[PDB]
């Protein structure tokens, strides 16, 4: 909640004194709420 | 720290004038501040 809600992808990394770095990005797990929301949105457009 | 106690008995060369043999070790909290004389044991005279 600090900010940057509109964030496309989370990524985290650390770097070495020589300057080599390691970056870890996880794969997004979907939310049932979102899929249901899309279906309802189309239903609202038909039934507004 | 050992070099600091050893000053006037054993001599340690310093690559940089800014950093001293009596310089507080805590100032050297990072690798980039590791001394070149410190980095190579052979570079330091075993006699010194």
């Amino acid at each position: 909640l600090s900010g940057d809600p509109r964030m496309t992808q989370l990524a985290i990394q650390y770097q070495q004194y020589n300057g080599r770095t390691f970056n870890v990005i996880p794969e997004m797990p979907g939310s049932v709420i979102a899929d249901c929301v899309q279906l309802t949105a189309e239903v609202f457009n038909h039934e507004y | 720290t050992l070099a600091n106690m050893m000053v006037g008995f054993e001599t340690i060369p310093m690559d940089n004038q800014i950093y001293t043999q009596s310089r507080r070790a805590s100032a050297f909290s990072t690798p980039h501040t590791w001394p070149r004389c410190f980095m190579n044991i052979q570079l330091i005279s075993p006699i010194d």
């Binding site: 990524a11 990394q13 770097q15 300057g19 770095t21 970056n23 990005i25 | 990072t30 980039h32 501040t33």
Partner: protein, 417 residues
């Protein structure tokens, strides 16, 4: 480290007299009698609000050009065969002392006396004057200005920019010292660095020298679009959010997951942009100042004699038979190169690059019209006052408006990586 100090006087382009009038000299000496001052050459401008436009100073480069002509006439007095510093007035200018630190209004009998009959294109050696030879530090400090002037005189077309790359420059806590400016704009960092160099001379291989070289290299790569958030050098890059901006400034930036790859090696060279808009280009003039300080610190390789005007070929301190070749790039075309590299990377949409190009075309047309109008005004003034003829700026041609193989030079810079 440069060891030989010499300069060659500017030659009038078909003029019979120095292209300056006493009014211009007075404007340059608005409150001062020493031209050695860097601010004397240019009123420092911070960009955006940067760029000095004046009736006598349409551009800061115009002011520097007038300063150069005036200095060329005045310097000849202590460089005369007599090498006298106070006996005669050049256009009513008398040096205050033998070191010629300051100049003064000519004495009334001296004002009555004629000015020094300066000869154009006179190459001089700094050691010839004894007082300067007596102070090496003084001589080197004076030479920074001399080097910048000679470089501008050397370029028949637009001035080259010297760029070199050293990984040993990356090595060290001096990199942390460079990191002190992290989040600083390129212009702000340059002003501070220039002030530091003015404060004192530095080693030709000095940690400061390597840092300045890295800063210049990063800025130029960013300008060409060579280095980006998607193409970071060790994650370190100067970033300008909007290209073509009035004061777009690449600012030191870090990008994760987009590290760029650089060929091992050491490459140092100078590139001269074709566009004449450089007079209004703050970054180019700042780069010129830094490059000149770098030349004072270290003696670079002589540039190719074919790469130099034949009259100036084989200059002992500057031109050599085998040397680097100047690279000419139109500013608008170079901005296009920056956009194309990003489009090819796919970081930005083709439409966005086209929008940037359209803005650049509009800016270029407006600037070209203004410069052409100033040119007409200057010709009219010269016809009006043969007695007091002067040039607001070194004359320019519509030919400079062309790209002049900016794309070939862009391929060359890409190859330089």
């Amino acid at each position: 480290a440069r060891a030989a100090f010499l300069f060659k006087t500017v030659g009038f382009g078909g003029l019979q007299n120095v292209p300056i009038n006493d009014e211009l000299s007075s404007h340059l000496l608005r409150a001062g009698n020493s031209p050695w001052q860097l601010t004397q050459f240019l009123d420092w401008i911070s960009l955006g609000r940067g760029l000095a436009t004046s009736a006598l100073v349409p551009t800061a480069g115009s002011r520097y050009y007038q300063m150069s002509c005036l200095l060329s006439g005045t310097l000849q007095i202590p460089f005369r065969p007599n090498h006298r510093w106070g006996d005669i007035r050049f256009l009513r200018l008398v040096w205050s002392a033998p070191t010629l630190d300051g100049l003064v209004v000519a004495p009334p009998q001296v004002l009555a006396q004629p000015a020094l009959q300066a000869q154009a294109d006179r190459v001089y050696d700094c050691d010839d004057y004894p007082f300067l030879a007596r102070d090496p530090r003084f001589k080197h400090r004076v030479y920074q200005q001399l080097s910048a002037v000679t470089l501008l005189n050397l370029t028949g077309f637009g001035p080259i920019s010297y760029v070199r790359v050293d990984e040993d420059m990356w090595s060290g806590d001096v990199n942390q010292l460079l990191m002190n400016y992290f989040g600083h704009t390129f212009a702000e960092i340059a002003y501070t660095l220039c002030q530091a160099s003015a404060n004192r001379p530095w080693e030709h291989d000095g940690t400061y020298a390597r840092m300045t070289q890295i800063i210049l290299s990063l800025f130029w790569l960013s300008y060409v679009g060579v280095i980006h958030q998607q193409n970071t050098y060790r994650t370190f890059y100067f970033q300008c959010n909007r290209r073509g901006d009035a004061a777009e400034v690449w600012i030191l930036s870090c990008s994760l997951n987009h590290s760029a790859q650089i060929r091992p090696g050491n490459r140092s060279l100078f590139v001269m942009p074709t566009s004449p808009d450089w007079n209004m280009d703050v970054n180019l003039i700042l780069s010129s100042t830094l490059t000149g300080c770098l030349c004072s610190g270290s003696q670079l390789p002589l540039i190719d004699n074919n790469s130099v005007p034949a009259v100036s070929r084989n200059i002992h301190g500057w031109t050599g038979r085998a040397g680097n070749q100047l690279h000419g790039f139109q500013v608008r075309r170079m901005v296009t190169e920056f956009c194309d590299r990003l489009r090819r990377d796919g970081v930005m949409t083709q439409a966005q690059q086209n929008q940037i190009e359209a803005l650049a075309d509009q800016t270029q047309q407006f600037k070209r019209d203004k410069l052409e109008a100033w040119a007409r005004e200057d010709d009219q003034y010269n016809q009006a006052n043969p007695n007091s003829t002067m040039f607001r700026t070194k004359p320019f041609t519509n030919a400079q408006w062309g790209r002049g193989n900016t794309g070939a030079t862009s391929a060359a810079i890409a190859a330089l990586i």
